[PDB]
Ligand binder design. Structure first.
Ligand SMILES: N=C(N)c1ccc(OCc2cccc(COc3ccc(C(=N)N)cc3)n2)cc1
Length: 91
DNA sequence: AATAAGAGGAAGTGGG
DNA sequence: TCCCACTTCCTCTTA
């Protein structure tokens, strides 16, 4: 099954949820969730995964924080903004 | 307060 | 056995 950062990157490349997530600086890999429409994206993540409970943005971001140490995604000091690593962007 | 974003320990679940 | 890659729950902090 797909990993959360690849789910997000695929969305950004495809544009299927442009109202929920967008690039801020795509050359840098920085991207931002919609304040009002991120839950719809979180819901799609849970359904894609087949999880038992409804996915929320809060639980999705709990998981995103775990990439901080390994580096795939880091929190940026801007509202609802994160950054993919160059490795993730290259692959 | 109400609302929202942000945080992480810890326990539980998947699929190796 | 025991790590993967989250998921779920709870309690809290900051703005
Ligand atoms: N269960 C426990 N014992 C426990 C005890 C203490 C905890 O602390 C959590 C914690 C620590 C440090 C910083 C923060 C929040 O940071 C933020 C920064 C910026 C914003 C914003 N831009 N609005 C919002 C939040 N939250 C967590 C659990």
């Amino acid at each position: 099954k797909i990993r959360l950062y690849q789910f997000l990157l695929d969305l950004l490349r495809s544009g299927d949820m442009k109202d929920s997530i967008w690039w801020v600086d795509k050359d840098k890999g920085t991207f931002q969730f919609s304040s009002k429409h991120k839950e719809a994206l979180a819901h799609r993540w849970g359904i894609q995964k087949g999880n038992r409970k409804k996915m929320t943005y809060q639980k999705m971001a709990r998981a995103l924080r775990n990439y901080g140490k390994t580096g795939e995604v880091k929190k940026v000091k801007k509202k609802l903004t994160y950054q993919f690593s160059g490795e993730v962007l290259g692959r």
